[PDB]
Design an enzyme around this catalytic site. Structure first.
Site, mmCIF file in Angstrom:
data_model
loop_
_atom_site.group_PDB
_atom_site.id
_atom_site.type_symbol
_atom_site.label_atom_id
_atom_site.label_comp_id
_atom_site.label_asym_id
_atom_site.label_seq_id
_atom_site.Cartn_x
_atom_site.Cartn_y
_atom_site.Cartn_z
ATOM 1 C CB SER A 1 -0.847 0.001 1.270
ATOM 2 O OG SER A 1 -1.545 1.224 1.429
ATOM 3 C CE1 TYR B 1 -3.681 -0.559 3.780
ATOM 4 C CE2 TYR B 1 -4.958 -2.539 4.221
ATOM 5 C CZ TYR B 1 -4.379 -1.666 3.329
ATOM 6 O OH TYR B 1 -4.518 -1.913 1.982
#
Ligand SMILES: [Cl-]
Ligand SMILES: [Cl-]
Ligand SMILES: [Cl-]
Ligand SMILES: [Cl-]
Lengths: 253, 253, 253, 253
Positions: free
Chosen positions: C144, C157
């Protein structure tokens, strides 16, 4: 002590004013004898005097950091006076704001020369002497947040500062064996006299505050700790690293 | 002064011995009151005893850093005694050497929990209290050279330490606005008792020396400067950064 | 043929919908037989049929990627038939938005397990077979923008994705010798289901467009090229790398 | 089609021989019309004449990439004819091996000019036209593993390649809004003529193979996929990225 610079002599380029002057005052406060540098002799003399009037052991040597002849002449003068540079901060360099498609080669070149080539030329002279003396040494290059992420309209600066980051690694690679630690500081957005147009602009100020999670500009004195750290015994096993002082800017998406 | 920790209280997890113990002793020497933590209570008391006998203001609190109930109980006890944790070093974590194809899930999980989740849980409790006091605070996470580049046979550790690097950025992102600075140290190859099999292996020792341009291992005391730096006023405008202390290893190809 | 995946069988986890589905569709279009995995069996079967209707050779295998027994059973079935997974994309992983000081451990752990641990477990089973067949393989983990820079409220995350970045380096370290290339894709802000709330918030939308110099969100099909690239002969000498597909976001200060 | 370059014309600097010639052949094979460049005209002609006989649509324009007048002459020419450069690969640049303490400024400068300044100058001419046409564009700069980690004796090259990495970010920053994608390739150790000395040395060959987990040198055609990838629609939402093609070298500690 770990962070004590007493007995050490530092040379800071481009230190008549701005962040360079702050590094110099900061190293003096930690006990270093300091040598300031700027291209303008008269301005340099005023800055040297300001530090002397505060009780610091300050001196000035004026030279163009892009002129290799002037640089070696300066280090030869220092040699003759029995002055050893133990700590070097390569803070010299200019800025030029212009989109790349409009950017004149002459201006590109001046940014690269004053920011990137200067660090090679001054470090070459200083490191040779550190090596010859077997005294060890500290070299601190000045990067930028642009060593990591680009800002529009300052491409040659960005390229130079990305180059400074890697040049720092090369100096580690070649000189660490002589007990020389070369590292870099990457200042964020710091309140300087030079940045004053930026701070005064409400939109730019808002952008800075929304881009760093500290929600504020840094002040020049907030760079001093990092300079002293990288100039002292505290950093003896640190080499080729760049430390960003940006209140969290690069850390946040 | 810039690097003085007088008036500050530090908690270092997994500090009964090794690097954690060295951080605790270093912070104490800089003037901090230190609280050592380990899961081994008898070993902890011995280490606390050792520091007190050198004249340090040292204390121990034993708790499992993966057990949030144990952590909150530990912090509640500290609260009841009027003890404010101003500096947290998250040094706790285990190592497990095994190729991934042979690696059992329980062991993968134990490495992730003790290295990565532990830093979240202890920091959460510490940060909540720093924020409520509006005292400011310092959190230092412990990464590794594996935060940047991997070594075979230590994948969960590598994953965990890559996670620590980014968790550090998250703590900058969320807490810098409360004048908390969260940064990280990535120790290189350092001589400790745990590493003694590595140091005593001729082949491994030669590889270390040929991989870092300083041509030597580091010693635990060479990490103390960075810990004090990141725990002190010197790092007030540093956030989300990892500082590698590796003699230049990562800098060289 | 350089970008052709004919003769290859790919497995894509978390591919019932969103970017996972797009990866599956893209590999199929490049010639691959695709096996879609998700925990949601109902719409997994629905997605497989959609791909089938489009002319592609798609199949569905539903299992929880955090359950090592279900994983081994699923691969053991693939073993009992003649199915070789030559390409693995580890797209599975959940998101959970909450500031750290309010974040329950349960949720932290679910994010870590589903993003990071899942990638270890599924790759372990896949790699073992690739190594035994000695026919090489490709593994693509999904990072990400938070593998590099943090956003508030998504700390687990972010930690998981930084971990994925370094886990990718570990897989290169341990498996490159068996001609398996393991790399990662770091998607930027893409128009997909998991970003619906973000996309519909006028302010977030404006923030995305001002933060990436392409001044727009990406589309899911703009990730397909990178997936096919990392799955094909074109990536034979690429290992342990993460390629960000973000319109230039990380590149700009 | 995703990787098809039909309808695109590419200019590759320094492509008479070595990796630049490979890139040119690679783009031609993907459908592009290719323009080779070098300062040596008849060598360049031999190289163009070579590709044409293999049935590629190849052409050559001779010019010094450090001479801004020559570069414009070439473009102003192409401009005068009906030639649109849609893809630019900046492969030009020289090497110079010498410890910094022994390095003459003239050689430092030549390395900087040929590697970094050249990429600025050629890209400037190309981007101005891409922008004016509003037909998008692709620019690929050539970095090196030294864009990330240094090697002793090649400091100006390392600094230049670090500069190239950030210059790539600047080009994304300024030109992504005109649908131009600028990215970089960072080749590892590749079997080429320019590496002959390196390759046929047993110690050096051994050190390459122990430093990359693939345990081998890369081949020139293993760079082709990346060049096509970054020149094609597959990279439309990729900007400011450097992809290292090194068998996993940088991934491993
Ligand atoms: Cl095990
Ligand atoms: Cl089983
Ligand atoms: Cl929660
Ligand atoms: Cl020379």
């Amino acid at each position: 002590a770990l962070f004590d610079l007493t007995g050490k002599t530092a040379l800071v380029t481009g230190s008549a004013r701005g962040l360079g002057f702050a590094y110099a005052e900061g190293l003096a406060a930690a006990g270093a004898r300091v040598i300031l540098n700027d291209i303008r002799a008269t301005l340099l003399a005023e800055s040297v005097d300001t530090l002397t009037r505060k009780g610091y052991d300050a001196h000035g040597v004026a030279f163009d950091v892009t002129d290799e002849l002037a640089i070696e002449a300066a280090f030869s003068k220092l040699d003759a006076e029995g002055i050893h540079v133990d700590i070097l901060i390569n803070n010299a360099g200019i800025q030029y704001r212009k989109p790349m498609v409009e950017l004149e080669l002459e201006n590109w070149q001046k940014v690269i020369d004053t920011n990137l080539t200067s660090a090679f030329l001054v470090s070459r002279s200083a490191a040779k002497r550190m090596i010859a003396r077997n005294s060890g040494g500290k070299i601190i290059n000045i990067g930028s947040l642009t060593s990591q992420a680009a800002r529009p309209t300052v491409a040659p600066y960005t390229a130079a500062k990305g180059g400074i980051k890697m040049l720092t690694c090369s100096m580690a690679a070649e000189w660490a064996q002589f007990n020389i630690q070369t590292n870099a500081i990457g200042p964020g957005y710091i309140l300087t006299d030079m940045n004053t147009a930026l701070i005064e602009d409400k939109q730019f100020d808002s952008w800075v505050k929304s881009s760093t999670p500290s929600q504020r500009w840094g002040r020049p004195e907030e760079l001093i700790g990092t300079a002293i750290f990288l100039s002292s015994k505290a950093s003896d096993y640190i080499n080729g690293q760049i430390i960003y002082v940006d209140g969290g800017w690069l850390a946040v998406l």
